Amino acid sequence: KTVFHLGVTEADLNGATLAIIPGDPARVQKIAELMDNPVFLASHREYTVYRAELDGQSVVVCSTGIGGPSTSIAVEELAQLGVRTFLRVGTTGAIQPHVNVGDMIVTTGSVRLDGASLHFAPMEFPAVPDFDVATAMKAAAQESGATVHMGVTASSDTFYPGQERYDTFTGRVVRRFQGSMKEWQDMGVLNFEMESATLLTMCASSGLKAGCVAGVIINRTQKETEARSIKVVVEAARKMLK
Amino acid sequence: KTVFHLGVTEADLNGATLAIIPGDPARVQKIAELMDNPVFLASHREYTVYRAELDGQSVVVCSTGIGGPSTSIAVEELAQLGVRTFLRVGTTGAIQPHVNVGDMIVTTGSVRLDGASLHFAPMEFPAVPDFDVATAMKAAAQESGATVHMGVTASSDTFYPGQERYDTFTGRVVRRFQGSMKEWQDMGVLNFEMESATLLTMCASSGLKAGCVAGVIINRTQHATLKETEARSIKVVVEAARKMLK
Amino acid sequence: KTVFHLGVTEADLNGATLAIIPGDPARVQKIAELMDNPVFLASHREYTVYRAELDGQSVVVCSTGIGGPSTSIAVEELAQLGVRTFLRVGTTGAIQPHVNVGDMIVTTGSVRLDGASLHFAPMEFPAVPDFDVATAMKAAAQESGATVHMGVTASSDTFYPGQERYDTFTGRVVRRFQGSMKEWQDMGVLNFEMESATLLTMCASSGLKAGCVAGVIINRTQKEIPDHATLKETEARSIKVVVEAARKMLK
Amino acid sequence: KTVFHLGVTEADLNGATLAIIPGDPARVQKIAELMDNPVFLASHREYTVYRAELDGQSVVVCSTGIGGPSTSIAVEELAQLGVRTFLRVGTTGAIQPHVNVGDMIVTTGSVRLDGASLHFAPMEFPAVPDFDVATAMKAAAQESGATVHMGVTASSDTFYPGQERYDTFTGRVVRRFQGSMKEWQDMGVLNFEMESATLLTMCASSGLKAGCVAGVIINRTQKEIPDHATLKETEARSIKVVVEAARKMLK
Amino acid sequence: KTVFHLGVTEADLNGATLAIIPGDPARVQKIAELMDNPVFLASHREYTVYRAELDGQSVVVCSTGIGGPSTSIAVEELAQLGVRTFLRVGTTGAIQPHVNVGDMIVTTGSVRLDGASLHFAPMEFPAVPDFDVATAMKAAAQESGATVHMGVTASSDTFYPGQERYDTFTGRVVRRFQGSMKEWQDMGVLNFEMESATLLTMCASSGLKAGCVAGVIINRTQATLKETEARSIKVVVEAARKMLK
Amino acid sequence: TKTVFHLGVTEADLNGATLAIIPGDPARVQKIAELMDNPVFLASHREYTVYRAELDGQSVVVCSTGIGGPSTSIAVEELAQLGVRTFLRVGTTGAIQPHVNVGDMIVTTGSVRLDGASLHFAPMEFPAVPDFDVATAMKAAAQESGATVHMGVTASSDTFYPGQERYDTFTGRVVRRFQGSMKEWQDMGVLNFEMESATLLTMCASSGLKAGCVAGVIINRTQTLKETEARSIKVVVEAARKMLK
Ligand SMILES: NC[C@@H](N)Cn1cc(F)c(=O)[nH]c1=O
Ligand SMILES: NC[C@H](N)Cn1cc(F)c(=O)[nH]c1=O
Ligand SMILES: NC[C@H](N)Cn1cc(F)c(=O)[nH]c1=O
């Protein structure tokens, strides 16, 4: 009746079938306060589970922590409780020069540089969002006033070598990832983040709806964004309740 | 002079930046005839080529033949002649019982059960269409009055074992594909075809816009209406093309 | 028994057990005209099927279109209708400086740079031709007055990046195939083409006998530019060779 | 200019070159408060950081959050601030019958069911603890009076399908992991966890010392839920072992 | 410098450009005995080397030992010493019921169930004999009187699980190889052995000629040991003769 | 009532032996068993020389494995069928770290699986690691001999040449996979190259058998002493003794 990690029950969600899933537990309260009567439900480790109401419908806000592994946990347990739509909000780093800090990235597809996506569908299966969620997100983003890019997102199990950072303890990137950033760029990939591949694959392959939206905070080639980011997702969420 | 396979020049396209790419050459004339001023350009192997006009703009219509390799050739040479947008069109068989014959499947992503996609991007790259193209296609498809499904398509390099068919010469399916049909169905995969993985990956990784839409003519949850769904299918890809052009 | 794609029946074949399978439909007519009383059986998509008699014996000639996916459908449906032997003929580009435009290459194994071969057997399985088809083919090739090479062919699902061509729209090649031409060269690979890996693997793993012979129409290593005389000559040669190979295979 | 995620500087570590890295942030204070002069340093996200002293040497305790990605970040950033030794403590579920609740598992190697390890070394590289750290944990564990097992831990990027759980929303396990648990049992594997393949591989291939010890609180081969005073006892003991093990690693 | 494992010099070979490479060091002397002027050269580990002559020309017989790594070493070092052509000979157990005891199999290609081949060429590359060697081997086998099969050989890094043997210490076979024998059986694979994938791939990818011929002494699905052995080595020496003239 | 296929021995012949020392060279077997009591020739077929000896009153096996995981996995499988449960690899090796000197001892705590045969026992993800007691016992025997001792990762290769990135060979070619590879393993702290540990360790750890590897440094590519060869088998014999108590 009560899930293993989130420590909540189905009655707790008051029939919520949509969750906004940031990674940061501190984003959780703040997102809920762009909605109504935010109720604390549980807080175990990186998962802080809040209920709130949005346009007179119950919705979940659940932090996921960092990485596909912690994410796959939150999504599975919430789905056990009836949740069917999962909205990913956060911030990202752009790798295309034409993309500016302030812009929103809505993922049309994730490059699968993770491990947990593989635990749901084999590698040939695409990491793709639900079209309705991506649509709602694009719309909500455009209406916000921001410049908006639809495109492919590289989703990496690491922050440093998998995103080809050299400014690290050993200054070394494993062979697979050497020259990788330039490869994604010439392939038109827009950004690097760390959760969308597991999110989109586990959802696309398990009859769940998911999408990813994110604000550009750094550009490896070249606040208002963070605030307009959760603003954009709460509105994307609104659009999704039809 | 001309591109190596298609046998057309950039002059023949008359400034076309959008191509419609049906699989079978026999349908090329039908599609071009839904537009303004059809003209036959050439026929070489499985590449039958026509030029037409849509709202005052040139449009190429070009068959691809079957499978990722001949598709990869058409799309490459087309791109050399200035095409930047590709709308794939055809008829398909669904594998999800809730999908009726007559409906339109607009592919949001493809399972890469091909070889040619790996020649453009490693297996981790998503085989996804351009958002604008999938958006026009869904718009066009709904406009035609049919029910529309956006979802995943399994793109195989073979018609038989890769689509786990046992009624064959050997009766045999290689380990990789035994149980695969039920695996895809459980994963929500909508249908099978054989060029979308190669198309979507080559274009997504090369600065090109691509999309697929198909009419369901049969359900593997086992037709008569083949002619009609086809007609509806190419009307939709011509309307999607118009939306993409303006 | 009308097969799904080729749309012919076993009757249509008259007991034919051997097929010659070019890629181009246009070449099916000419291979036929090297044999007797050509019978158009069907034509759907890139698949053009013809019965013809060679040495008083019924033999199919079937176009396969470009690529393993297209080829596997054609071989599968032929095989459902009694064909046990298949001879691939075509053109190829050589990557060894000692191989001249106009020579004949008979494939002894293919590098599997394709996807359809995997739908019949795992990568560890060798894409190898039937020993008798390769023997007959080499013999036919010598007898026709051409220089003949036996060896490994790299068989690619693409004509462009998988054969490391940079003269393309993007002008770039994915990591896997970056530097790959020089690697095949250093390994003794003779040439590139697009269908041998799927054919050989599927046939070798399915109790079908098969082989591939191609005429060299370009050498990426030779600065020389060939002509149209020897071009037309060695394509006429190749299909003339593939018919003498088939004859040797019949008895 | 603190590290991006962790929110600490090298001066806050006070010259510490050893870290205890539990998964749960709620445990960091408890671990620190077994040492001398524990101070709260920072808490961002799932990263809760404390400092303490052990026998006259500064020690850091930093939580990692669930999974390889979250762990790799903590480890990388801890190393940038000078940490060269990483000791993982936690509780776990053993998949072998002969392994009992309250026992200690000390990992000598990890099956790599993660993705983050691959970002440091290719799959061929073993996910191996530092011999001195694993030696130090075996000694600490034994002296605690508990039964100790040295063996293989299966380390999965998921808690459900990748540990072959069927009690889930879809009830589905992907082919790769169907039958996998019996495979691991047959191969002598002691337990599932979710962070050891990444940590071990990252450290082994990066000039850092790491090892893993966990307390067995439940056995999946056994129906029962164990005594819930054994829960806290095993838990209390688990951190008493890694603190003693850490003291051994110093000196 | 001089060859590290083999313990012979290029001079010791007296210009030999062809080697006959058996697995068992015990068969080296007897292969060499069928040829003119047999001479013991060296014995280090699994590597027993002899020289002999075939119609005026020097030949080496060098045992390889068991498995691809041992074989990769011998071939490489013989290659350093001037060898260009390698004829593998031996005995085998068929897995096709239609292949009878005393028949000869000539490998036209190997399934790469090995690791060492990957040290010479990616998996996509075919483990395939030289056409000339396989043709000479066919002809020598045919001329012997034995029924001759040209086909695919499965080449395994293990004798036990990778050939799907369950009569073992664990009784257990890893997933990749569960049901694998039937699969090879269905695909037409003629037999199992343990060195050909490594030999064929490293030769085919390094400008060396090579082939494999083997006598069928037993069938998995179902005197002769002495007899098939003799026929097998007479076959390879005749093959070696054809290759030199 | 049963003789193993390759080794040609029975469980009776082992006299209750549950421990084997397993070097490469059969010539080392007689060397190793000379450090022990009442050596007994059990068999020799191909590259497998099998000796029973008594060590500190207990029955113990010494068995050569030849070169490579394939040959080695057969030896281990068949000894395991005969009750052997603990395996001690001894050998020579070549370091790739400058601080490691000729004459040092390396105890393998993990192997990079650059082999094929490991895969026949467990998927690639499974760690090729030694039993802890054996590694510990070996470290102990190594330090007690006076020599300098390193614990760490070993790169374990199905080839002597291209998979250890040697270019001093017939072709001078190294396949892409192993191009740049020595520098990669050097950067990852890898200690040494050899050719059997991955197969041995993976097969044993996945089959409920205990094993470990100790080797004497005879070369450093970034920079044989008979003393260090003798050191090596004395340590392994002494490691065995600590394993028997
Ligand atoms: N006989 C050589 C081999 N079995 C052990 N070895 C010794 C070396 F020095 C080396 O660099 N690589 C090896 O594999
Ligand atoms: N703390 C980082 C989050 N995991 C997402 N993210 C954000 C970036 F800016 C970035 O460059 N990379 C990235 O992964
Ligand atoms: N039209 C191309 C055919 N697929 C065969 N071919 C021909 C070449 F010249 C060539 O360089 N590559 C190649 O594959």
Residues A103 and A148: beta-carbon distance below 8 Å: yes
**Chains E and C touch, using 3 or more CB pairs below 8 Å:** yes
Residue in the block written with tokens 């995103």: A163
Residues F94 and F218: beta-carbon distance below 8 Å: yes
- Atom number in ligand 3 closest to CA C90: 5
Residues C149 and C230: beta-carbon distance below 8 Å: no
Closest CA relative to residue F115, chosen from E157, D87, E4: E157
* CB environment D160-176: b (16+ within 10 A), e (fewer): bbbbbbeebbbeebbee
Q: How far is CA D159 from the centre of its chain?
A: 15
Closest CA relative to residue F166, chosen from F69, F66, F94, F65: F94
Burial tier of B139 (Cβ tally within 10 Å: 0-12, 13-18, 19+): middle
DSSP B76: H
- Binding-site annotation, residues of C for cytidine: 5, 91, 163, 165, 194-195
Q: Which two tokens stand for residue C105?
A: 């290459």
Q: How far is CA F15 from the centre of its chain?
A: 23
Q: Which two tokens stand for residue F47?
A: 């590259």
Residues F144 and D144: beta-carbon distance below 8 Å: no
Residues C161 and C168: beta-carbon distance below 8 Å: yes
Q: Is A5 a catalytic residue?
A: yes
- Tell me the C-alpha distance between D190 and D93, whole Å: 9
E154-173 residues touching D, CB cutoff 8 A:
170, 172
Rounded to a whole number, what is the distance in Å from the CA of B80 to chain C's nearest CA?
Answer: 5
How far CA A83 is from CA of A173, A207, C220, D165, in Å, comes to 39, 11, 58, 20
Q: Which two tokens stand for residue F169?
A: 């060979």
A110 vs B contacts (CB less than 8 Å)? 126
Task: Compute the distance from residue B21 Cα to the ligand 3 centre, in Å.
Answer: 22
- Tell me the C-alpha distance between F104 and F215, whole Å: 8
- Tell me the C-alpha distance between F123 and F109, whole Å: 19
How far CA E71 is from CA of B240, E116, F66, F159, in Å, comes to 62, 9, 11, 9
Residues F86 and F20: beta-carbon distance below 8 Å: yes
- Tell me the C-alpha distance between F35 and F236, whole Å: 10
Kindly list the partner chains of chain D, i.e. chains with 3 or more CB atom pairs below 8 Å: A, B, E, F
Which technique was the structure solved with, according to the deposited record? X-ray
E120 vs F contacts (CB less than 8 Å)? 162, 175
- Tell me the C-alpha distance between D201 and D206, whole Å: 8
Residues B205 and B125: beta-carbon distance below 8 Å: yes
Residue F161 CB less than 6 A away from ligand 1:
no
Q: Is B228 a catalytic residue?
A: no
Identify residue D51 by its one-letter amino acid code: R
Residues A119 and D161: beta-carbon distance below 8 Å: yes
Residue in the block written with tokens 């070097």: F23
Rounded to a whole number, what is the distance in Å from the CA of E167 to chain B's nearest CA?
Answer: 24
Closest CA relative to residue A188, chosen from A99, A124, A91: A99
Query: How far apart are the two ends of chain B, measured CA to CA in Å?
Result: 32
Rounded to a whole number, what is the distance in Å from the CA of B20 to chain C's nearest CA?
Answer: 17
Q: Which helix (H) or strand (E) holds E236?
A: helix E224-244
Of the listed D220, D233, D235, D247, which one is catalytic? D220
- Tell me the C-alpha distance between A20 and A31, whole Å: 8
For D72, list phi and psi in degrees, rounded to 5. -65, -35
Q: Is D5 annotated as a binding residue?
A: yes
DSSP string, E158-222: -SSGGGT--SSSS----GGGTTHHHHHHHHT--EEESSHHHHHHHHHTTT-EEEEEEEEEEETT-
- Tell me the C-alpha distance between D70 and D65, whole Å: 6
**CB-based contact (8 Å) between F80 and chain E?**
yes
Q: Which two tokens stand for residue E165?
A: 């043997």
DSSP string, A159-222: SSGGGT--SSSS----GGGTTHHHHHHHTT--EEESSHHHHHHHHHTTT-EEEEEEEEEEES--
Substitution target in C111, C177, C180, C186 with the highest count of F β-carbons within 10 Å is C186
DSSP string, C175-239: GGGTTHHHHHHHTT--EEESSHHHHHHHHHTTT-EEEEEEEEEEETT------SHHHHHHHHHHH
Burial tier of C30 (Cβ tally within 10 Å: 0-12, 13-18, 19+): middle
Which residues are within 8 A (CB) of C162 and not within 5 positions of it... i.e. 6 or more apart? Answer: B116, B119, C113, C156, C177, C180
| Domains in chain B: ranges and CATH | 1-246 (3.40.50.1580)
How far CA D51 is from CA of D34, D55, D199, D242, in Å, comes to 11, 13, 21, 15
E65 vs F contacts (CB less than 8 Å)? 46-47, 66-68, 71
Residues B102 and B215: beta-carbon distance below 8 Å: yes
Which residues are within 8 A (CB) of B57 and not within 5 positions of it... i.e. 6 or more apart? Answer: B15, B16, B17, B18, B245, B246
- Count of pairs with CB atoms under 8 A, one residue in A, one in C: 4
Kindly list the partner chains of chain B, i.e. chains with 3 or more CB atom pairs below 8 Å: A, C, D, E
Q: Is A46 a catalytic residue?
A: no
- Atom number in ligand 3 closest to CA C220: 11
Angle in degrees, CA D17, D23, D26, rounded to 5: 100
Handedness of CA B127, C126, B176, C63 (dihedral sign): positive
**Chains E and A touch, using 3 or more CB pairs below 8 Å:** no
- Tell me the C-alpha distance between C88 and F16, whole Å: 63
- Tell me the C-alpha distance between F241 and B113, whole Å: 56
* CB environment F204-231: b (16+ within 10 A), e (fewer): bbbbebbbbbbbbbbebbeeeeeebbeb
Cβ neighbours, 10 Å, residue D251: 7
Instruction: Please report which residue ranges of D66-116 form alpha helices under DSSP H.
Output: 68-80
- Tell me the C-alpha distance between C99 and C216, whole Å: 8
Closest CA relative to residue F111, chosen from F53, F194, F197: F197
- Tell me the C-alpha distance between E134 and E111, whole Å: 17
- Tell me the C-alpha distance between D71 and D157, whole Å: 12
Q: Whose alpha carbon is nearest atom 12 of ligand 2?
A: A193
Q: Is E191 annotated as a binding residue?
A: no
- Tell me the C-alpha distance between D92 and B53, whole Å: 68
Residues A88 and A199: beta-carbon distance below 8 Å: yes
How far CA B209 is from CA of A227, B135, C88, E83, in Å, comes to 32, 12, 36, 56
- Resolution stated for this PDB structure, in Å: 2.1
Q: Where are the beta strands (DSSP E) in C104-166?
A: 104-113, 148-156
DSSP string, A101-119: TT-EEEEEEEEEE-SSGGG
Nearest C-alpha in A relative to F189: A170
Residue C164 CB less than 6 A away from ligand 3:
no
How far CA B165 is from CA of A213, B159, C136, C150, F59, in Å, comes to 40, 8, 34, 36, 59
Cβ neighbours, 10 Å, residue F45: 14
Closest CA relative to residue E215, chosen from E196, E234, E228: E228
DSSP string, chain F: ----TTT---TGGGTT--EEEE-S-HHHHHHHHTTSEEEEEEEEETTEEEEEEEETTEEEEEE---SSHHHHHHHHHHHHHTT--EEEEEEEEEE-STTPPTT-EEEEEEEEEESSSGGGTS-TTS-----HHHHHHHHHHHHHTT--EEEEEEEEES-SSGGGT---SSS----GGGTTHHHHHHHTT--EEESSHHHHHHHHHTTT-EEEEEEEEEEETT---HHHHHHHHHHHHHHHHHH--
Is D72 within 8 Å of A175 when comparing Cβ atoms? no
Q: Whose alpha carbon is nearest atom 11 of ligand 1?
A: F94
Which residues are within 8 A (CB) of A110 and not within 5 positions of it... i.e. 6 or more apart? Answer: A127, A128, A152, A153, A154, A155, A196, A197, A199, A200, A201, A212, B126
Which residues are within 8 A (CB) of C56 and not within 5 positions of it... i.e. 6 or more apart? Answer: none
- Tell me the C-alpha distance between A112 and B126, whole Å: 8
**Chains B and C touch, using 3 or more CB pairs below 8 Å:** yes
Residue F194 CB less than 6 A away from ligand 1:
yes
Residue in the block written with tokens 């069917």: A84
Residues E210 and E134: beta-carbon distance below 8 Å: no
Q: Which helix (H) or strand (E) holds B200?
A: helix B196-204
Residues A90 and A23: beta-carbon distance below 8 Å: yes
- Atom number in ligand 2 closest to CA A163: 12
- Tell me the C-alpha distance between E130 and B190, whole Å: 47
Identify residue A133 by its one-letter amino acid code: V
| SS3 state of residue B166 | coil
Among D124, D204, D206, select the one facing F124 at the smallest CB separation: D124
Q: Which helix (H) or strand (E) holds C32?
A: helix C25-32
How far CA D127 is from CA of A117, D190, F96, F185, in Å, comes to 21, 15, 20, 14
Rounded to a whole number, what is the distance in Å from the CA of B120 to chain C's nearest CA?
Answer: 6
Closest CA relative to residue B10, chosen from B67, B60, B62: B60
Q: Is C143 a catalytic residue?
A: no
**CB-based contact (8 Å) between C186 and chain F?**
yes
Phi-psi region of E45 (alpha: psi -120 to 50; beta: other; left: phi over 0): left
Is E186 within 8 Å of B172 when comparing Cβ atoms? yes
